[PDB]
Amino acid sequence: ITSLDTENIDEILNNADVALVNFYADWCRFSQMLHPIFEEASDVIKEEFPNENQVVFARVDCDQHSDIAQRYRISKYPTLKLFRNGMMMKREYRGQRSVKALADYIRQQKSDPIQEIRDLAEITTLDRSKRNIIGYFEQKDSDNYRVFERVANILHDDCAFLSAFGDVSKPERYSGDNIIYKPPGHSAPDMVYLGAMTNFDVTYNWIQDKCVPLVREITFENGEELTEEGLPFLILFHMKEDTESLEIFQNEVARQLISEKGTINFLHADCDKFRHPLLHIQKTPADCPVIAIDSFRHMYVFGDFKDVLIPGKLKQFVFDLHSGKLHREFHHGPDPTDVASSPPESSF
Amino acid sequence: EITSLDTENIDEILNNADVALVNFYADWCRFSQMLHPIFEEASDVIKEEFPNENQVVFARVDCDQHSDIAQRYRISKYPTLKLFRNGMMMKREYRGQRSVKALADYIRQQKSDPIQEIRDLAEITTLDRSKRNIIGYFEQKDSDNYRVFERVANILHDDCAFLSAFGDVSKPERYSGDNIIYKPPGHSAPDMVYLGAMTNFDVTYNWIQDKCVPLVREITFENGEELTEEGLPFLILFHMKEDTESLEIFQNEVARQLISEKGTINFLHADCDKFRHPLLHIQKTPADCPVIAIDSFRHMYVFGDFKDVLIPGKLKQFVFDLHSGKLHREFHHGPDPASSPPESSF
Ligand SMILES: [Cl-]
Ligand SMILES: [Cl-]
Ligand SMILES: [Cl-]
Ligand SMILES: [Cl-]
Ligand SMILES: [Zn+2]
Ligand SMILES: [Zn+2]
Ligand SMILES: [Zn+2]
Ligand SMILES: [Zn+2]
Ligand SMILES: [Zn+2]
C-alpha cells in the first residue's frame, strides 16, 4: 500500500489497471480510522489479485501534496477514488469504510462486464430497451480488443458491451475489426465505428458519445454526485422555456470543446431553481441566459451570452480557466488590452 | 535585503523585528512577479534610512511552499502585504499601491512617532474631547515606561490619540511618579486611570486596547472587507435591528467567557435583515434570529439555540470546538459520539 508523491504519482497510477486511492489528512479522525482498514483490504485483495498491477492500493497525504488533492478536487477526508490506468472514474467510492465493503467493491470493479457472443444469432435477441455496443474482433489478443475492454470497464454502467471473435465474428468483419452501436428501440439504424480502434481517446469518445449526453442538467438531486466527478463546471443557466439558449450552447460545446471533454463538465441549470448560485455572480434569472464556470474555488462569468456566437470565444473561456487567467482577473481585474498596480480584491 | 521565511525561522525573525513588512506571494500570481523587483527596491531605499538590525525588516513568504504559514495569517490571494511589530500582526493590511514611493512612504509613516508631546498642561484642559485620548505623564522620555507607551501607541494610534508630558511639565501630575490616564469622549465623561505596571507591555497594552477598541463590533457592508483583512475568524451575532436584548446578552457573555480569546476571534454582531444571504448559508432566515455563528472562512458553524449562551461555559466551548477542529469534523462527518464517507454538509 504505496504513498503517492508529486513525482511518482503519474508513473504509478498509469501502470495500474485498477487503483483505489485514499486521499486523507492526518487531522481527519475518520482518515486514521481507515489506515488499518485500508491496509487489511489491501492484503485481502493482494492475495485474490496477486499479479502485477491487477489491483493497486495507494494513498495521498493531502496536507503534504495540496496540489495532488487540488488536481482531483478533493475537499474532505477521507475520499476514496477509483483509477483505471491513471484515469479517475466519475463515480467516487461512497460505500462503507469496512475491510469487507472495500474488498467487495474491488471484487465487482475487477469483474468483466463484456458478454462474449458465441453465436451471431444472439444479436437478434438483445434487449432493445437498453443500448448495446458490440465489438467484432479477429482475436481477443489484439490492441483493438484491449482498447475496447478499457472503454467497457469505464462505461459498463452506461451501456451493455458485447464481443465476438474469430470465426463467430468473421461475417461482420468485411472491412476488419469494427464496433457496432445498436440504439434503443427500433427507430434508428446501427451505427458502425471503423476508425482508429487502437486509439483509446478517439474510440472512447465515439462510444461515450452514444451513451452519455454531452451537456447534462445539474439539479439539486444530482449536484453532489456531479461534483464528485472531479471536474470544474461549464454551466449554462437558462429558463426552461428558453430552448434557443440551450440549443446554441449544445452546438457550440459540441463544435468547440471536444478536446476539452475530459477536463471540464458541460452542464445546464434551470435558473429559477438556481437563483442562489446566480447571486454569487451578481445575476438574477432575468439576466439569463448566463454562461459561467464553477471551478469550486470561485465562479467565473463568461460575458454577454451573445458572445458564444463569436467563433472560438467559448474555447478561449475554457482555456482562460486552465491558464489561470480567470482566477487572476477575478482578484486583480481584467488584464490590459495592450499606472502602478492595486492590491488584490476579495471579489472585484 | 529580502529575507525568505520558512516554518523553522518565522517566529525568530519577526519577533526581533520592531517593524516587519511581509510579502505573502505565489509564483503563479503575475502581480506577485511584478512586486518582487519593487519590493527589493523599497527595502533598499528603507535600509538606507534605517540601518540598524531589526529597525525595519522586509521579508517574504512563498505561500505555495508554506501553505501552513499562509493559513496562519489567513492569506487567500496574492500578493498580500502585512505589517508586523515584534511578531504581532497589525490588523490593518497594507492596501496601498505597489510602487517604491508608496511602499517607502508607508514604512516611513509606520516608523514615525505618533505620540504628541505637550509643552504646557494647559493643552490637556483645552484638549479635544470629540476623540479618544490617552495621556502619559512620564519622568523622562528615556524611561522604560515611555518605551512601553511608545509600543502601545504604535499599534493603536489609529484608534486613539496618544499624548505625553515630560520632566518639568509632567511634574505636578506625577505625585506618584509615572502614570497613564484615559480621557473618554465628551467633556462629561470621567477620567479612568491606569493602575497596572507601566513597564509591562502585555498588561499596559491590554488595558489601553480595552479603552480603545470595542469588544463587539458591528459588521456592515462598508467595513466587511476591512474586518476580514484582520485575519481572524468571526464569532458573530445575527439579530434584528430592534433586538437589543440579544445583543446585550451577547456582549456580556463574550466579556465573561471569551477574554482569553480576544486576540484570536473577532466578536461581531450583524443586522440580520441586511445579511439575509449569509444566514441563508446556515439554513437560517431573519425570522430564526437571534443566531450565533462562527465564520471560519472555510465554513460557517451554527452555535445552536440562542438560549444556550446563558449556560456557563457553552459559549466558550463553541470557540474551543472551532480551534480543536471539532466543528469542522462534525460539519463533514456529523455529530461526534464501520465509518460513513464524509459529506459536504450534514
Ligand atoms: Cl474533513
Ligand atoms: Cl492570480
Ligand atoms: Cl491570486
Ligand atoms: Cl475532519
Ligand atoms: Zn471542509
Ligand atoms: Zn474528515
Ligand atoms: Zn450564497
Ligand atoms: Zn482565489
Ligand atoms: Zn494574484
PDB file of C-alpha atoms in Angstrom, chain A residues 18 45 48-49 55 57 84 100-112:
ATOM      1  CA  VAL A  18      -7.144  -0.668 -11.250  1.00  0.00           C
ATOM      2  CA  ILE A  45      -7.110  -8.074  -2.260  1.00  0.00           C
ATOM      3  CA  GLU A  48      -7.072 -12.500  -4.546  1.00  0.00           C
ATOM      4  CA  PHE A  49      -5.350 -10.351  -7.238  1.00  0.00           C
ATOM      5  CA  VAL A  55      -5.265  -4.062  -8.175  1.00  0.00           C
ATOM      6  CA  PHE A  57      -3.859   0.405  -3.263  1.00  0.00           C
ATOM      7  CA  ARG A  84      -8.122   2.787 -14.275  1.00  0.00           C
ATOM      8  CA  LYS A 100     -15.375  -6.196   3.866  1.00  0.00           C
ATOM      9  CA  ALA A 101     -17.020  -3.383   1.882  1.00  0.00           C
ATOM     10  CA  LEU A 102     -13.756  -2.284   0.275  1.00  0.00           C
ATOM     11  CA  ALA A 103     -12.967  -5.859  -0.763  1.00  0.00           C
ATOM     12  CA  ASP A 104     -16.403  -6.426  -2.302  1.00  0.00           C
ATOM     13  CA  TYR A 105     -16.072  -3.124  -4.182  1.00  0.00           C
ATOM     14  CA  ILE A 106     -12.751  -4.129  -5.730  1.00  0.00           C
ATOM     15  CA  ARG A 107     -14.292  -7.536  -6.482  1.00  0.00           C
ATOM     16  CA  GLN A 108     -17.052  -6.020  -8.648  1.00  0.00           C
ATOM     17  CA  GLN A 109     -14.867  -3.402 -10.316  1.00  0.00           C
ATOM     18  CA  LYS A 110     -12.498  -6.191 -11.396  1.00  0.00           C
ATOM     19  CA  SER A 111     -15.309  -8.292 -12.883  1.00  0.00           C
ATOM     20  CA  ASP A 112     -15.531  -8.479 -16.672  1.00  0.00           C
TER      21      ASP A 112
END
